[PDB]
Amino acid sequence: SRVVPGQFDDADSS
Amino acid sequence: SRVVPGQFDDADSS
Amino acid sequence: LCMPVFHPRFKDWNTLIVGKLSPWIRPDSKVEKIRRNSEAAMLQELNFGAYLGLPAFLLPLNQEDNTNLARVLTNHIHTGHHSSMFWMRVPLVAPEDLRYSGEEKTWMWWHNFRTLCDYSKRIAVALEIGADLPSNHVIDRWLGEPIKAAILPTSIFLTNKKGFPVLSKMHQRLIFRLLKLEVQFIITGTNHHSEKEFCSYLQYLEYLSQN
Amino acid sequence: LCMPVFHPRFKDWNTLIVGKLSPWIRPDSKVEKIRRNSEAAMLQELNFGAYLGLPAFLLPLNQEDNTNLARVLTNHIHTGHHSSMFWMRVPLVAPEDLRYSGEEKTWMWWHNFRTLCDYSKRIAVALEIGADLPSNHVIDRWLGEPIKAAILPTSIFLTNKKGFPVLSKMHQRLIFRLLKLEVQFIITGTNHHSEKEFCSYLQYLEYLSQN
């Protein structure tokens, strides 16, 4: 439950 | 969930 | 047997319980016998839910005709011992479509049932999201209806470079439109999902709140 | 993974959610490695519970020594992101006893932990009932403590002539003493129990309210 850098970044692929 | 007669009577045995 | 709803505590989550009708129950089965068995079992379960004080109850509609489902439900409300909110589980897109009768189909489903219950304030909708998304004219229509919750399967999340669940860009625009109504959330497919993994889906949705 | 508590709406039930620590977690294991793994996992789960807004969390104590369990818990409270109530799951009678060090043993367990947490108002007890019952001098002692809930296994109910679950006469006198404090209820052993069968246990307890 500790947020990390880039956690919420978009999928650069599908 | 419709209560019937004697539902809550005591166990006449163990 | 019940189901956990998650309501965002940001206007920090909150969790509540809603009941779920057993799946084998099909009050509008073409078959006679199933209709009678299901009409009976539905009332058993609605009263068990009222007895526990469940704030809402989830009833699925996934076909055109729901006259039987509307009647049993109207009857159960008349008694006075009711959970006092009923969330109809409806797909934004019909699953049979993906292998006005078009993309507005499932809306008509709801609208027809809605009118059968005389626009009862006790009846709302719990909308189920899939991979396919319909137009905006139909998305607009739905947003006029009373959506209490949105049902999101784990299968519609992409994983990103860092290896975490995220929503497609189209899906992000939809959800954001749903957090504007303050709906509650339900996540399906938590099977084979650690409790630390399931926690991230909620983290993402909380982040998505500010975008 | 969570657990449903049932609170009597009579002063008509109500249902709420409390979290449960995974069972493999043993912060005071004699073994070093388990202590470290468990101390870590406990915090993972306490914060996941706070994140969901769970009103209480169930932490088991079933041995004399709980220094490790008290410390991790005191640490987690200090952070400020806490479910804000912790119910310690304690047996009225020690299970190893049934195949002051006597019947007051499990009370000392709690009392010792209670003092380790500096009589924290966030810490209460969830008392577990078995078949054996201790004296009244020890029942008196417990009723001074802050019991929030009582844990009742299906296995302690007798069936009566009509074929329904009922409490032994001794057990009835105890429970009645517990509905006087307005505790909440937890029923274990619902496995292999239809939802219509599980409903009767609650019916009985509601009847027992007037006796």
Question: Concatenated DSSP letters for D117-178?
Answer: TTS-TTEEEEEEP-SS---HHHHHHHHHS-EEEEEEEGGGEEE-TTS-EEE-HHHHHHHHHH
- N- to C-terminal Cα separation, chain A: 25
Residue C51 contacts B where some CB pair is shorter than 8 Å: yes
How does DSSP assign C60-113, residue by residue?
A: E--SS--HHHHHHHHHHHHHS-S-S-EEEEEESS-TTT----STTHHHHHHHHH
Distance in angstroms (rounded) separating the CA atoms of residues C30 and C189: 29
How does DSSP assign D182-199, residue by residue?
A: T-EEEEE--TT--HHHHH
Q: Which two tokens stand for residue C118?
A: 């005389």
Cα D152 off chain centre by? 9
DSSP D84: S
Any idea how long chain D is? 211
- Would you call C158 and A13 a contact, using CB atoms and an 8 Å cutoff? yes
Distance in angstroms (rounded) separating the CA atoms of residues C54 and D111: 36
Contacts of D90 (CB under 8 A, 6+ apart): D60, D61, D62, D106, D109, D110, D125, D126, D127, D128
CB C9 within 8 A of CB D52: no
- Would you call D200 and B7 a contact, using CB atoms and an 8 Å cutoff? yes
Q: Map residue C208 onto helix, strand or coil.
A: helix
- Chain D, 141 to 200: residues with Cβ < 8 Å from chain B are 158-162, 164, 166, 168-169, 196, 199-200
Kindly report the number of other CB atoms within 10 A of residue C42's CB atom.
Answer: 22
Pairing of strands C2-8, C13-20: antiparallel
Q: Identify which of D28, D53, D48 has the alpha carbon closest to the alpha carbon of residue D38.
A: D28
Closest Cα of chain B to D125: distance in Å?
29
Neighbours of chain C (3+ CB pairs under 8 A): A, B, D
Q: In chain D, which residues have their Cβ closer than 8 Å to the Cβ of A1?
A: 44, 47-48, 51
Neighbours of chain D (3+ CB pairs under 8 A): A, B, C
Distance in angstroms (rounded) separating the CA atoms of residues C149 and C25: 22
- N- to C-terminal Cα separation, chain D: 36
Q: In chain B, which residues have their Cβ closer than 8 Å to the Cβ of C51?
A: 1
Q: Experimental technique used?
A: X-ray
Please name the member of C15, C44, C48 whose beta carbon is closest to the beta carbon of D52: C15
D165 to each of B2, C80, C179, D13, D208, how far by Cα in Å?
15, 28, 46, 18, 12
Distance in angstroms (rounded) separating the CA atoms of residues C206 and C13: 9
Any idea how long chain C is? 211
Distance in angstroms (rounded) separating the CA atoms of residues C122 and C81: 13
CB C157 within 8 A of CB C200: no
CB C130 within 8 A of CB C92: yes
Q: Which two tokens stand for residue C113?
A: 């049932």
Q: In chain A, which residues have their Cβ closer than 8 Å to the Cβ of C169?
A: 10
Helical ranges in D12-150 per DSSP H: 32-51, 67-79, 105-116, 136-144
- Chain B, 1 to 14: residues with Cβ < 8 Å from chain D are 1, 3-4, 6-14
Q: Cα-Cα-Cα-Cα dihedral of D20, D21, D24, D30, to 10°?
A: -140
CB D4 within 8 A of CB D16: yes
Closest Cα of chain B to D167: distance in Å?
8
Q: Identify which of C171, C173, C166, C88 has the alpha carbon closest to the alpha carbon of residue C129.
A: C171
Among chain C residues, CA nearest to D56: C15
Q: Map residue C184 onto helix, strand or coil.
A: strand
Q: Which of C16, C190, C195 to mutate to test the interface with D (most CBs of D within 10 A)?
A: C195
Burial classification of residue C43, based on how many CB atoms lie within 10 Å of its CB (0-12 exposed, 13-18 middle, 19 or more buried): middle
- N- to C-terminal Cα separation, chain B: 25
Closest Cα of chain D to A14: distance in Å?
29
- N- to C-terminal Cα separation, chain C: 36
Amino acid at D97: D
Domains of chain C and any CATH numbers? 2-208 (3.20.20.150)
Handedness of CA C156, C158, C163, C164 (dihedral sign): negative
Distance in angstroms (rounded) separating the CA atoms of residues C148 and D12: 25
How does DSSP assign C24-56, residue by residue?
A: T--TT-SSHHHHHHHHHHHHHHHHHHHHTT-SE
Q: Which residues of C175-195 are buried (b: 16+ CB within 10 A; e: fewer)?
A: beebbeeebbbbbeeeeeeee
Q: Max Cα separation, chain D?
A: 54
Taking the CA atoms of chain B, what radius of gyration do you get in angstroms? 9
Go through chain C and list every residue after which a break occurs, taking a C to next N gap over 2.5 angstroms, comma-separated: 11, 99
Taking the CA atoms of chain A, what radius of gyration do you get in angstroms? 9
